[PDB]
């Protein structure tokens, strides 16, 4: 029930650049007892336009390593001061049902410009 991302705020290209290290600790999830996880970048608050990519999803697993960098081209300064920066993680099963496993919520103003920042904290319920 933890997770480890890596952030990145570079001001030359004002490239809002984020790195999902890995998940630990995935409670169960299909009937079967088996798990495919994946994550999901939402900028929020912003225009459903794009301001959301999906991470790559990992099959059999209960404590996968994304080790993942998904890049947003187009923030500005006034945006990363403005935005937050939401890291959804999701589980994946058959063409029936799905369910959440955890996220978390951060305020792009923590990011400095031409600095990374590692992140390892535990996730919280969602209604
Ligand atoms: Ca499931
Ligand atoms: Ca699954």
Known sequence: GA???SLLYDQDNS???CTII???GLKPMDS???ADPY???HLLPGASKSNKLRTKTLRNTRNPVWNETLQYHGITEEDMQRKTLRISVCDEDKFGHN???GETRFSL???KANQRKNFNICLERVI
């Open 109 to 111: 103003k923590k990011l």
């Open 32 to 34: 079967n007892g088996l």
């Open 15 to 17: 490239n809002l650049q």
């Open 22 to 24: 890995r998940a630990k």
């Open 39 to 41: 994550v999901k970048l």
């Open 3 to 5: 997770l480890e991302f």
């Open 99 to 101: 369910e959440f496993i």
